[PDB]
Design an enzyme around this catalytic site. Structure first.
Site, PDB file in Angstrom:
ATOM      1  CB  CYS A 103      14.331  13.437  12.675  1.00 39.23           C
ATOM      2  SG  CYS A 103      14.536  11.874  10.822  1.00 39.23           S
TER       3      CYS A 103
ATOM      4  CB  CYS B 143      17.239  14.743  10.862  1.00 34.58           C
ATOM      5  SG  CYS B 143      15.901  14.324   9.379  1.00 34.58           S
TER       6      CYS B 143
END
Length: 112
Positions: free
Chosen positions: A38, A35
């Site tokens: 993230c 991700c």
């Protein structure tokens, strides 16, 4: 107060002791390594944990490795930052935000 903050990767197995029973508020970063958003926030969380470590603890919950805890808290967008106090979610930040925006969202925990 210190120049580094602490970090612990919490699991389904360790979540009660590490998070639900903590004295301080605990910011749990529900993340995954694929991700990009993230990855983006990871330096911000590092800076926050150092700057405000007297007030709050940062830990990470990898959702690929720990499903379960993800599914328990209904986490279906990442990153999701849940702050736990007294064993329940007190504040939730859903989606990556700049450092200054996260710090505003954490004001009730880290202004003290």
């Amino acid at each position: 107060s210190h120049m580094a903050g602490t970090l612990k990767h919490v699991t389904d197995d360790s979540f009660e002791q590490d998070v639900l029973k903590n004295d301080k508020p605990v910011l749990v970063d529900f993340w995954a390594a694929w991700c990009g958003p993230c990855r983006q926030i990871a330096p911000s969380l590092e800076a926050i944990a150092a700057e405000y470590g007297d007030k709050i603890e940062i830990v990470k919950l990898n959702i690929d490795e720990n499903p379960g805890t993800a599914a328990k808290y209904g986490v279906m967008s990442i990153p999701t930052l849940n702050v736990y106090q007294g064993g329940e979610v007190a504040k939730t930040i859903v989606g990556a935000k700049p450092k200054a925006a996260i710090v505003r969202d954490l004001e009730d925990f880290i202004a003290d």
